[PDB]
Design an enzyme around this catalytic site. Structure first.
Site, PDB file in Angstrom:
ATOM      1  N   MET D  69       0.823  -1.274   0.113  1.00 54.67           N
ATOM      2  CA  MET D  69       0.052   0.029  -0.115  1.00 54.67           C
ATOM      3  C   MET D  69       0.952   1.178   0.039  1.00 54.67           C
ATOM      4  O   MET D  69       2.006   1.276   0.741  1.00 54.67           O
ATOM      5  CB  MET D  69      -1.124   0.072   1.161  1.00 54.67           C
ATOM      6  N   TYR D  74      -2.748   6.976   0.550  1.00 51.44           N
ATOM      7  CA  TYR D  74      -3.978   6.625   1.398  1.00 51.44           C
ATOM      8  C   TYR D  74      -4.330   7.554   2.465  1.00 51.44           C
ATOM      9  O   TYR D  74      -5.503   7.909   2.200  1.00 51.44           O
ATOM     10  CB  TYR D  74      -3.714   5.277   1.859  1.00 51.44           C
ATOM     11  N   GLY D 119       0.454  -5.666   1.231  1.00 51.54           N
ATOM     12  CA  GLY D 119      -0.776  -5.823   0.225  1.00 51.54           C
ATOM     13  C   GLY D 119      -0.493  -6.398  -0.964  1.00 51.54           C
ATOM     14  O   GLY D 119      -1.582  -6.808  -1.706  1.00 51.54           O
ATOM     15  N   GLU D 142       4.103  -5.680   7.478  1.00 52.34           N
ATOM     16  CA  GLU D 142       2.912  -4.884   8.279  1.00 52.34           C
ATOM     17  C   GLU D 142       3.405  -5.058   9.628  1.00 52.34           C
ATOM     18  O   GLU D 142       3.328  -3.746  10.455  1.00 52.34           O
ATOM     19  CB  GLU D 142       1.635  -5.601   8.152  1.00 52.34           C
ATOM     20  N   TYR D 238     -20.657 -30.809 -10.752  1.00 47.86           N
ATOM     21  CA  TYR D 238     -21.492 -31.109 -11.880  1.00 47.86           C
ATOM     22  C   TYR D 238     -22.347 -29.986 -12.488  1.00 47.86           C
ATOM     23  O   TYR D 238     -22.411 -29.953 -13.588  1.00 47.86           O
ATOM     24  CB  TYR D 238     -22.553 -32.209 -11.727  1.00 47.86           C
TER      25      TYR D 238
END
Lengths: 249, 249, 249, 248, 248, 248
Positions: D69, D74, D119, D142, D238
């Site tokens: 990130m 941000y 991230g 992190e 199926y």
């Protein structure tokens, strides 16, 4: 009759697309013996491939739907054999009561004409829809016989009857009538016994008018969707729709 | 109006914190076309970031809530394209009907003024709460059109309506009125059409008084807790509570 | 009394197999303080091994069942400690409210004599069965205090009260009476306060007549079967039945 | 070229049915800002309907795949706006990283050329297949920044890396190289950086040889069947087979 | 020392923020009796609130880690009392072995010095991380004693060891050594017994460098996210991140 | 011999408590036709009640284990009959391949001598344990035939083979050998074909030494516990232990 005399503990009568399946040990209140279990596996497998049967109605001979598992017959058959026979006898009970029945290829209706006790709760709820008589009596008598509910009985309750009512009837073993069964959601409707066959028949004929492949996708996909998340069901339910379109053609 | 003329198949009117969202193709009973689906994605994304909208009410123009999916418009758009267009058109239906709507950041209420058929069941149940008119008619007509319920319709039923009633209405395609909808748990309440707007408005204004972050944690955590065990929920529900405390500040 | 003076916030009285457990802080509407939580862990562990206690009834002193969590006492105890004390205080709440209580070895009944708010919903639903007074008032007031429901309250609702009603009461924080509690499935029955003790006592004595090991398998297996598929339950429910047969001997 | 100058933070090159998608902020280690997230949603939606793109390869410009990130951009967007902007920003990140990408209609391959941190693990695992350079370096940093893994990073690990190894790398934040990534199952294969593109291209061309509708059913059904019991899967798998037969 | 003579079946040494917890019945291979289970509940509750303990290491005295359940002392307690005593005894075993330990507030490391049989598998896997000696010997001996694995032993295997290898060791009851434990994923690493304590200590000190609230969110969220779908985890893992931010 | 000439597509040899079950259409690579599916249901039901069979070994005649579904004979039966015949045919395939076999009352071992393609993956994984020849060749060829994997094939992979490797082999349809099967966890062990039967026989005799009721509880409880949470498993796995004690 096409199926006359074919099974010793069950009768099957076809009428205009309706397969009337009668549990037929009336003197024993249609108690589910190991023989009855094997015969009912054969009934469901046979009727699945019978082009003349579009809907199944499961009912009981005499004043009984089913009183549940046949104690005498189970133990005479188990005690006479090694341990491994109990595994086979349980599989045979499951096989007709819900492994074939709950996601049956054809629509199913329980027509509960009388006593419905203990083990009868499994096929009762495997059946897609259910109509009872007001005069029918239900109970989970297992606790008063010193066993917890066996096979899928407790799950049959968990799927249809609210938490508190399920526990009340499982824990106390108290009986309840057709009106209470309908009120709690165990069946779709309770009617006077004298109107039971006609009510069941009108519902059966309604289901017979539907495209069988589409009805199968709709009823069985609903039962499975209960178990899946919304994200999982986006995938599963559109796959059942597309599968329906392929198999209808 | 802030949103006047902005969408061709939907109208949005803000009043004192209430975003009244009207499905607006009345001559087509507000059938959900691919255009309506794309516009409703845009409505929900826009209203999420509109500080003046504290609660959404989803209603229908004319005598209809929604008659479900627009058959004509879906197939004109699909058949004109390669296979991959059907995947996009289904995603657009899901995106507004429940992927954004079911766990929407703001409280949501379905105000069911009239016809609610087939595909309309998905956004009906994604909406947190629902009030209908007594005069409203509901049905899962898919079976009579030769398709099982598509998208999340069967799961929408599984989450709100008992097993037996869900299967009865899915399998038969029978219609039911507002009173039955309320009795079965599909909506919170059924009222005379002439009291529908006022009943919905009083509920909306109640929800507007709550702390938005706390209301979001409470409503959306409830929906997710249904899917988790008690041990899993000890962790999840305390995490939602602590998350609420952080985001309120 | 065997247990006289033993706990400061709880009273226990044994009568003919019935352990009457009274939450006993009447001036604080039996608010669940950290002390009450630790004492109730000790009550449940003690009564589990008391051969003279065959059934537990959980009730409240005075006009209250429980008003929920004791705000003052929680924060005086938390703020005075490092972060890690909140983890222990939450575990102690869970431990009696549902980790021991929901799958308790003995049958449990909530006897709801009065106010039941917020945190009280967790032990209310962990208790197997519940009878309330008509005069009892219930509510999920958390939303109006600026918190989503904490601990297992939202799951307690998810297990007993329909989706729409659960969300209505969680989102609005509106109160409801004993009759509504019974109608929604939160309790088994609502009776006049003057008949509450006798109704509860007759149910308790019914449960006392059952084989304890069998009753345990039946009630606790039901609660677990809700979480499992039919194929998983074939295995689990027959294992609980066979386990019952071993432990009864 | 077809997509020249279309996006500010991403480059798309289409050749021989292969959509080469390059995260393109090399000076910032292709950090995933809110703008890159919005552009990547547009890229995936655009390429899904591009009949000339049969397979997607997700790679990075420069020495990075993605550093994870963009904290700076941000917090510039969120701290500016009301609380509700964070809901939209998180949703945009999820939308491209896995909501569209994990069960994407076309086959997807992550081509991990370099740094892959935090991230980046979400789209790494959302991608069907993955090849990395031996020279690539991975880490769940992190913990060292004072946050647990956000978005779907921990689930990306849970789906691909054994319990013990996942917890070791999450708890310690220690880095690992391409060979260790392949050994742990995070990727299909680790090859020298000199052979990475050609190895990735050969795999992409193999996937293009398959019936696209059938390949979509096979890959996406597999991911879903992990979540379902055997009895549920008898029905589901199926249904996906019959759905393939209809849609083909 | 701080915890000297506190427990009859367990020893605790605190140093440099590390709580060294030694199962201490060496002559009985540290077999888990009902007394050891009750004392271990007390140990974990005590250490959770001990501000001077940042990481727990679970090890064994003598040549054993734990031989598993003390059959003799279990059956002495149960056969004495009513049926209901077995419920309490099983709960005490579960309480320390995984109900407190698997999602414990502090980082946990199993340091497997020797024999690790049967019931020992539950706390082994509840511990976040694990290092064993090469010289350690493991086995699921339950089958040879005529019982399937009890308590959470089979789930401990299911979470860490591949399906085929789990079933082989459960069905045959054959023993395996430290290197095989690491190869199968039952532990992080197998090292010579001569280096076991120092390797474990270096790992413990690394974990102590982390924000405790953040580490708790990261490790325990990972374990939970294994159980949840991607859509469920978008909600859950962001809630754990925001919870970390509040509690830090 | 006891089962001589009983089935047209399957051979059973019983010796020393071992039921050697040989898929027996060598010229058709033991392709699973509807007749072989019905006969295999009968074989498993018959052997379950045979007190002289304590362990089953599933193997193939000739150079094949099984090539997978017999397309020719399947489509001859289905296209003949109404839609509803396909429901019965699929159910027959599931019935022997995993509904009876995965949680079979007796221990089961797949002995993979040669080709194992597509549909063969379902019974391969339903079998408790598996040993293959190094010379065995595996593949999920469905993709190259224009179908996703049918029946439980994709779930068989999901239970035994890592996410990345499963998707690689499903998406590409590339073949892999015995050593790669063992490396990925699809089987317990890959040994030379010259040693396959003797290795399988030694394992089978080890399993016969165990209490059959206890072994059934241990193996089948393990498979189920994979699906359940730790809290659910505390209840379930103690119930299987107490059930074992009753049934023994």
């Amino acid at each position: 009759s096409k199926y006359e005399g074919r099974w010793t503990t069950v009768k099957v009568e076809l009428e205009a697309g309706i397969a009337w399946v009668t549990l037929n040990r009336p003197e024993k209140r249609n108690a589910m013996s190991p023989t009855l279990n094997r015969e009912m596996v054969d009934v469901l497998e046979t009727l699945e491939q019978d082009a003349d049967a579009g809907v199944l109605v499961l009912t009981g001979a005499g004043e009984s739907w089913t009183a549940g598992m046949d104690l005498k017959e189970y133990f005479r058959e188990v005690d006479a054999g090694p341990e491994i026979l109990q595994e086979k006898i349980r599989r045979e009970a499951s096989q007709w009561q819900w492994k074939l029945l709950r996601l049956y290829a054809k629509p199913t209706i329980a027509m509960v004409n009388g006593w419905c006790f203990g083990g009868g709760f499994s096929p009762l709820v495997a059946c897609d829809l259910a109509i009872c008589a007001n005069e029918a009596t239900f109970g989970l008598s297992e606790i008063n016989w010193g066993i917890p509910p066996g096979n899928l009985v407790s799950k049959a309750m968990a799927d249809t009857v609210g938490h508190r009512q399920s526990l009340y009837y499982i824990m106390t073993g108290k009986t309840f009538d057709g009106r209470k069964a309908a009120e709690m959601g165990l069946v779709n409707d309770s009617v006077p016994l004298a109107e039971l066959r006609e009510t069941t028949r009108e519902l059966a004929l309604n289901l017979l008018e539907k495209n069988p492949v589409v009805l199968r996708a709709a009823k069985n996909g609903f039962k499975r969707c209960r178990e899946l998340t919304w994200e999982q069901n986006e995938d599963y339910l559109y796959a059942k729709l597309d599968q329906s379109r392929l198999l209808d053609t």
